[PDB]
């Protein structure tokens, strides 16, 4: 009832990656029950970014995942009050990112306060050299450990030359309201795509499709 079939999405990200500060605003729309969403993104501060835009894109809401009726949908049940998540992104060459999103709802709009921090990226690595092409489609393993809803993903960035660049994700998810029922163990399939961008990635159009399933 709280989630409409068509929702607007507003987002602000404040970030610092290898010491470079930036701010990115997002304005988008999506269909929560189809697990689809699109966002227009614009670097407001700190452009042009000197690192691969792809490291940021999964920080730009698991409400936008199609859940079948026989899996508890913790994220849609988190509203209207909302929920927050925190994520570690551990890249195989030692680059480390931490991200967080505080998500609220007002009417038909999701608001997203995103923080992004990154460090230890090598100067000659694919992130600082902007040699990434896309994230491969992934499967997020959702489980509850120690009372905390957790999603683990073994992610991979496709690079120019067709090599892959591995990144481990761990996200913890927490409803703001007490007593939201936790789900059983399950999986969420994800794909994420940069649809368009300008030369310096000051403007980017982004899309995600996510579908939950059992084992």
**Domain 7-213: assigned CATH number:** 2.40.155.10
Strand, helix or coil for residue 3: coil
Pairing assessment for the beta strands 7-17 and 109-119 based on DSSP bridges = parallel
Element containing residue 106 per DSSP (H, E): strand 96-106
Looking at the DSSP bridge assignments, the partners of residue 154 are: 168
Domain ranges for the chain, please list them. Answer: 7-213
Q: CB-hemisphere CA count at 13 Å for 140? A: 23
Which tokens sit at 99? 């991200």
SS (H, E, C) 26-85: EEEEEEHHHCEEEEEEEEEECCCCCCCHHHHHHHCCCCCCECCCCCCCCCHHHCCCCEEE
- Of 206, 211, 213, 212, nearest to 37 by C-alpha is 206
Model resolution, angstroms: 1.9
Looking at the DSSP bridge assignments, the partners of residue 147 are: none
Contacts with 129 (C-beta within 8 Å, 6 or more apart), sequence order: none
Residue 37 buriedness (CB in 10 A; 0-12 / 13-18 / 19+) = buried
Tell how far CA 32 is from the center of its chain: 15
- Per the CB < 8 A criterion, the answer to whether 189 and 210 are in contact is yes
């Amino acid at each position: 009832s709280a989630i409409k079939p068509d929702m607007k999405i507003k987002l602000r990200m404040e970030g610092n990656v290898n010491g470079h500060h930036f701010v990115i605003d997002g304005d988008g729309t999506g269909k929560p029950f189809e697990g689809k969403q699109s966002m227009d993104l614009e670097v407001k501060e700190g452009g042009p970014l000197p690192f691969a835009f792809d490291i940021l894109t999964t920080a730009f809401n698991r409400v936008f995942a199609k859940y079948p009726d026989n899996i508890q949908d913790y994220f849609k049940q988190s509203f209207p009050k909302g929920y927050s998540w925190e994520r570690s992104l551990t890249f195989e060459d030692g680059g480390i990112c931490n991200a967080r999103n505080d998500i609220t709802m007002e009417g038909d709009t999701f608001y997203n306060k995103v923080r992004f921090y990154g460090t230890n990226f090598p100067a000659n690595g694919p992130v600082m050299q902007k040699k990434t092409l896309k994230w491969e489609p992934s499967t997020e393993k959702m489980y509850v450990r120690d009372g905390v809803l957790t999603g683990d993903i073994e992610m991979a960035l496709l690079l120019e030359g067709n090599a892959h660049y591995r990144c481990d994700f761990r996200t913890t998810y927490k409803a703001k309201e007490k007593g939201v029922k936790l789900p059983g163990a399950h999986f969420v399939d994800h794909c994420i795509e940069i649809l368009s961008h300008d030369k310096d990635y000051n403007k980017v159009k982004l899309y995600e499709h996510a579908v939950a399933h059992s084992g």
